[PDB]
Design a protein around this ligand. Structure first.
Ligand code: A1BCB
Ligand code: MG
Ligand code: NA
Ligand code: NA
Lengths: 241, 804, 334, 49
RNA sequence: GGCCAGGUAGCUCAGUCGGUAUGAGCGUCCGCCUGAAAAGCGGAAGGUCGGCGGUUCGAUCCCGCCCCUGGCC
């Protein structure tokens, strides 16, 4: 029974491991993974996503902008510009997931972080409907919350989707419904901004935060432990693979 | 702000006009609002109170008529004779407080005590009944596409849609009788380039300055978050809340000359109604006359024409301003007023006169005024008489296809009429003209959302689409996984690195002024003003996380990270807006990409303390430079490439313990021990080592080995070679391998020896060699000939001398 | 739905062993002739109850493997006999363990689907075939280099292989002294998950090594992956911002007491303030007494909501000392 | 440049790695992986086929 | 945006409206001690008291500006 581990194992980060599990879930459904720059142009982060010119998110309040003023260059507020780039580079149909670092202005406390990671999905094909969106969301939910997981959608608003909706998740392992993310059908202005005929192709999209998903699933009290890099937060999750 | 507050009693009242007897639980109404797309923030009841909470009349401390010829006795803003609410001894106020109460103490609103207007209630009536504490206030967050829902009119219409009720529009002319139009009310001129769509005026003459608004009006203003003031101002705020058209009252006697709508001038100021001086911009809209400025168009009125406690003649204003101009103006001077918030979300231009007439008649009723039969109604040049948007064509079954639900026949046409559109049929194509209060309905997708949200998203089935024939993970994505798995299994702990560099980190590193790592991208609005620079290297974030662990008792640490860096090649340059009505060309895309700083993906690691822990086997082993070199080899094996290490000088590394890493002939990064000065100036632990490689510079490989296993025995021999101390041991191994030829199966260094037997600044290296032929057994001479060729190769390439 | 949890676990186990220096082989299902006689197994040892092939390619090797170790040991001998004397091999495959004499099932008509009862009958007529993971080691475990002469394989390297497989499976195991051929009875651990036995590890019996022509000191491990349940933990760590207290404790016990039993007793008595415990010294000097040993553990105490005093930590240490006295007879070193 | 690898990396078997690549290829298209016993009944090995 | 209240050792926090923070608990170092440890006992190291300036022979404490947390908005 003497200890024998001369080189004790490390740990991949739980957010990276969750991102890997999410990617594997969508690969198994035929989707692929795309990536893009974190410092992004305003064209792909806002303009191509049907954001109005005087939108409050384009101000200095919520978005990290690159100096000097009016540079039209910023840290991306979502991974949506990665899907715009894919829509421009790839032929149809497109089924792509984008998992990357995202930057918001919220301060760092027990339930918010300015630097977070989110997963975004984008599917554009002939005849895609809201039923296909909901089927994909439920499959995503079961893979991450268990066999008894189910989603619920309620109408909302986002500039790049119409109709738009917020997603709630029901997981029967709570320590009820929890707000998970947003979704909707790809706005036809987004398709026209990428050279796609909205009369021939329809599409859907969704987006969830990884740190948020990890917090209420595992019941992690302080999200500052997720980002500060203390060894005591990562090692309990095991080496990971 | 997207906030909208109203009491349930008022909302139920408007809905009950067309649907008599309508009444639902506040929980049911909350679920209905959520189901059709209105986010409720809070459902707060009023009070509650019980026992002795009654209304009394005042006649410091004074006697209060509690009713029935009984007088109980127990500051600031109340005189003698005002009706007040008293808390008799034994009363229980929210929550647990067991006295002239205020609106805040009764949980009804926001300084002074509550003063009921004369005639609101007889002294002695039930307090909870007069205040209406059974009511419930709904706090909603209205999305920016539904400006029509910033009012009782819009939310009541939405409920009538969701419950399939008959709806009576409170802004209609059958509900707001048309006042006479016998001539102009006031001369005005409008510059059409300012975005005004409609401007209406109607005066009210001879109102009682001592009159006060009735209690039902004041109570509804309080529950909506607006403090009552005087009848002239209370009716303008009340009609704004009721119909969604903001209204403003000007003192008619303090208007000098023709009113004018005009763009402001640079440096021009305007004293607003709050008594604060505002600096104006050239892109702002103003109402002015022959003397001063009357209002900031769509934001707030000025103190020049402000209604005061003695005003008797009121000119009422009903105008439609440009939404972009109002938003651009109110955000510059930080005035998110109730009018500005509604104008920036667009206001229904068809109800301007209807709201004006409603306002004038209500003011005269409660203040005893006289409504003048004059009216000015500017509706553009040429005058606009039809405010309907362009029609929208879409197939009758388009919402069915998008939803994936076969709705009953007529569903789409019924729902689009329910929300106010004109719907005509032409075969299988509907021509839909949205109502004037729905400028968000512009194309079929907008119409689809209306049908789907009203039918309910819960009827959309969960149907997984078929799996496309995907290609899976790319070679680069797989490699990042293998690298992460390999470092973690070797005892490294992954962190998420922050992109914002610590203040003066490169000064702590002692880098030169022209070091490329200093050429950073700056953020304009960072959370920390002294950390605006984005990271050109992952090591500062890793070393920061290393300090955190060591400072908290975890002194034996090995951390790694995989993330992009930000390395600009020019000053921050943006590209102009590309039209969104088309696809950007490949030249415009390449121009967009070229304007962005280089963002390659790096892998990096830091180590400090014990590399191997102590235990029953021994005392463990402190971190050394070779551990950083081994991390490079772990990353290399994970990437399935060969690397070479060469001595180098590159801060922040120790110049005598720093390797530059090469793949083929391309430099991919550095590794080794950190400079003792950098460690001292950074508060790092002694002996800290570090690695950073550029993954994008490492080429992906797909080797196809075809080993052939020889069944013949091997020959073992060792060779000792003396070289100058500066000769890398790998260079000797390479020279031995090139000389030995194909018989050499394995070579491994197992001895490095210095001493006087060898000579100053020289060293002896002994390698274990394994020779094997693929087709025969070797003789010792066969192996020695390959060994002798290896020795001669080493003499020629690194100056080796056979050990003697 | 992608890979199952078991298919995923098999990949992770194989990656971890390979990264730890093990070389995977493909094991043959046919047992070498008389291997169980070389091992000295009893006539009634369950591993001797084998399924036999009627027409094998080698008439002396008809039986199918109930254990992966014979195929691994045969590959180890092939490597060592050809000049590769420092080797560590592993394999993941199914074994064949019948529970009765070979019994067939008559032909089911193929014009229809077999009923669920007929399917369960066909399954019950087959021998049990669970998945195993196994490994063998000999020679140098760590090679010589400019650091020193390297380190020969020892039983602790087989125990570490168990912990590599356990960490890869995200399960906790315990190791208990056992006697079980072909292992060395003094250097053999039985491996448990909870209270269920999942295999064995350690050094092989010297007599088995002699009779089988194996390298001296050969070590081995074999675990039944089917007996290790697939886990899906969801940790919720709470990082305490308060400082820790460091103390060491030296306890004297009888030599037969396992070190893990002492650590377990120390942990049970110390309570929730104990954040970490690590053994760093085992002393059997002359001041200790015959058949006894002194063990010294490094202890890390940390409170989740306050800074501790030395007395607070010493109180938890003293309760750990009393726990060890009661459970393993430990005496505080003095 | 001195050797630093104290624990020489091993290897997964190339046949196992090929099977893994083949499995990933089909999983990426929506297929799934199933398993069965090597000692099989004649009903499922021959008669059913 | 207001007058305030906070930033102090490696960690968590006290305390002083000018010449020593005789700072605490834990963390770090040395000795007695032990085969080596720890506790215990006895010795020590370490803060430029939020930054840039102003006053003063001398400023953690008094003036001005700014950085970041909160309370109330
Ligand atoms: C993490 C919270 O952000 C979101 O969920 C929202 C704002 N969102 C994105 O950020 C980008 O992807 C989306 C796709 C469809 C609807 C909404 C989104
Ligand atoms: Mg809409
Ligand atoms: Na070295
Ligand atoms: Na020389």
């Amino acid at each position: 029974t003497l200890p024998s581990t001369r080189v004790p194992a490390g740990a991949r980060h739980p957010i990276i491991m969750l991102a890997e599990h999410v990617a594997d879930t969508f690969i198994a459904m035929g989707w692929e993974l795309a990536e893009g720059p974190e410092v992004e142009t305003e064209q792909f982060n806002f303009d191509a996503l049907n954001f109005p010119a005087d939108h409050p998110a384009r101000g200095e309040q919520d978005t990290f902008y690159i100096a000097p003023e009016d540079s039209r260059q910023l840290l991306r507020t979502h991974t949506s510009p990665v899907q715009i780039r894919t829509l421009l580079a790839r032929e149809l149909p497109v089924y792509i997931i984008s998992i990357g670092r995202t930057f918001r202005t919220d301060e760092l406390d027990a339930t918010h972080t300015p630097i977070f990671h989110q997963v975004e999905g984008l599917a554009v094909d002939r005849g895609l409907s809201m039923a296909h969106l909901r089927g994909t969301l439920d499959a995503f939910a079961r893979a991450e919350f268990g066999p008894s997981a189910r989603t619920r959608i309620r109408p909302h608003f986002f500039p790049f989707t119409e109709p738009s909706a917020e997603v709630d998740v029901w997981f029967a392992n709570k320590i009820a419904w929890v707000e998970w993310g947003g979704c909707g059908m790809v706005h036809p202005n987004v398709l026209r901004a990428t050279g796609i005929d909205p009369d021939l192709y329809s599409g859907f999209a969704f987006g969830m935060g990884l740190e948020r998903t990890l917090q209420f699933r595992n019941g992690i009290p302080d999200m500052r432990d997720m980002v500060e890099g203390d060894v005591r937060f990562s090692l309990p999750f095991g080496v990971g693979a | 702000s997207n906030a909208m507050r109203l009491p349930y009693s008022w909302l139920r009242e408007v809905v009950a006009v067309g649907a008599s007897g309508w009444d639902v639980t506040p929980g049911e109404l909350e679920q209905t609002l959520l189901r059709i797309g209105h986010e409720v923030e809070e459902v707060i009841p009023l009070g509650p109170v019980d026992g002795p909470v009654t209304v009394g009349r005042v006649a410091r401390a004074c006697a209060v008529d509690i009713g029935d010829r009984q007088y109980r006795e127990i500051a600031t803003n109340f005189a003698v004779g005002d009706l007040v609410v008293v808390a008799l001894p034994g009363a229980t106020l929210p929550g647990g407080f067991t006295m002239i109460c205020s609106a805040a103490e009764l949980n009804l609103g926001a300084s002074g005590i509550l003063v009921l207007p004369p005639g609101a209630a007889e002294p002695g009536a039930d307090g909870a009944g007069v205040l209406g504490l059974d009511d419930v206030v709904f706090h909603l967050a209205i999305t920016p596409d539904r400006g029509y829902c910033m009012s009782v009119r819009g939310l009541a219409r939405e409920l009538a849609c969701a419950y399939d009720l008959d709806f009576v529009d409170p802004a209609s002319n059958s509900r707001v009788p048309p006042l006479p139009i016998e001539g102009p009310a006031w001369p005005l001129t409008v510059q059409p380039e300012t975005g005004v769509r409609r401007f209406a005026l109607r005066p009210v003459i001879g109102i009682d300055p001592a009159a006060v608004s009735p209690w039902w009006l004041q109570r509804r203003l309080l529950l909506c978050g607006i403090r009552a003031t005087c009848p002239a101002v209370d009716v303008t705020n009340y009609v704004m809340l009721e119909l969604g058209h903001p209204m403003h009252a000007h003192d008619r006697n303090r208007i000098s000359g023709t009113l004018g709508v005009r763009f402001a001038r640079s440096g021009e100021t305007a004293v607003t109604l709050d008594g604060i001086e505002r600096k104006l911009d050239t892109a702002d809209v103003l109402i002015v006359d022959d003397a001063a400025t009357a209002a900031i168009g769509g934001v707030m009125g000025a103190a020049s024409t402000e209604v005061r406690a003695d005003s008797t003649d009121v000119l009422l204003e009903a105008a439609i301003w440009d939404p972009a101009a109002v938003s651009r103006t109110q955000r510059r001077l930080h005035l998110p007023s109730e009018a500005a918030r509604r104008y920036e979300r667009t206001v229904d231009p068809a109800i301007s006169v209807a709201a004006l007439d409603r306002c004038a008649r209500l003011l005269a009723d409660i203040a005893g005024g006289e409504v003048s039969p004059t009216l000015t109604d500017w509706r553009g040049d040429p005058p606009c008489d039809d405010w309907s948007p362009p029609p929208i064509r879409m197939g009758v079954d388009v919402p069915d296809r998008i939803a994936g639900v076969a709705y009953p026949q007529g569903t789409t046409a019924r729902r689009l009429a329910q929300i106010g559109a004109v719907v005509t049929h032409d075969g299988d194509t509907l021509t839909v003209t949205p109502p004037s209060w729905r400028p968000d309905l512009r194309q079929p997708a907008d119409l689809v959302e209306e049908v789907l949200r009203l039918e309910g998203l819960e009827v959309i089935p969960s149907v997984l689409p078929p799996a496309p024939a995907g290609r899976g993970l790319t070679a680069g994505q797989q490699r990042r996984r293998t690298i992460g798995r390999s470092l973690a299994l070797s005892g490294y702990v992954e962190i998420l690195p922050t992109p914002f560099l610590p203040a003066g980190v490169f000064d702590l590193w002692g880098l030169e002024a022209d070091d490329s790592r200093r050429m950073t991208t700056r953020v304009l609005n960072p959370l920390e003003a002294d950390r605006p620079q984005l990271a050109t290297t992952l090591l500062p974030a890793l070393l920061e996380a290393l300090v955190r662990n060591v400072s908290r008792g975890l002194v034996d640490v090995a951390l790694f990270a995989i993330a992009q860096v930000v390395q600009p090649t020019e000053q921050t340059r943006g590209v102009g807006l590309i039209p969104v009505d088309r696809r950007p060309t490949d030249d415009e895309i390449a121009m967009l990409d070229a304007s962005l700083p280089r963002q390659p993906q790096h892998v990096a690691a830091v180590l400090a303390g014990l590399r191997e822990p102590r235990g029953p086997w021994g005392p463990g082993r402190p971190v050394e430079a070779a551990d950083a070199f081994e991390a490079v080899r772990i990353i290399a094996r994970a990437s399935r490439v060969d690397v070479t290490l060469r001595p180098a000088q590159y801060l922040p590394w120790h110049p005598g313990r720093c390797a530059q890493v090469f793949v083929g002939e391309s430099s991919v990064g550095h590794a080794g021990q950190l400079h003792p000065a950098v460690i001292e100036r950074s508060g790092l632990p002694k002996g800290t080592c570090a690695v950073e490689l550029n993954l994008d510079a490492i080429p992906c490989s797909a080797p196809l080995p075809a080993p052939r296993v020889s069944p013949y025995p091997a020959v073992f021999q060792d060779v000792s070679l003396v070289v100058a101390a500066d000769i890398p041991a790998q260079a000797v191994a390479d020279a031995v391998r090139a000389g030995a030829g194909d018989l050499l199966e394995d070579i491994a260094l197992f001895d490095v020896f210095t001493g006087p037997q060898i000579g100053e600044h020289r060293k002896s290296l002994t390698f274990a060699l394994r020779f094997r032929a693929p087709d025969r057994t070797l003789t010792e001479d066969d192996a020695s000939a390959a060994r002798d060729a290896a020795v001669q190769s080493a003499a020629e390439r690194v100056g080796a001398v056979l050990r003697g």
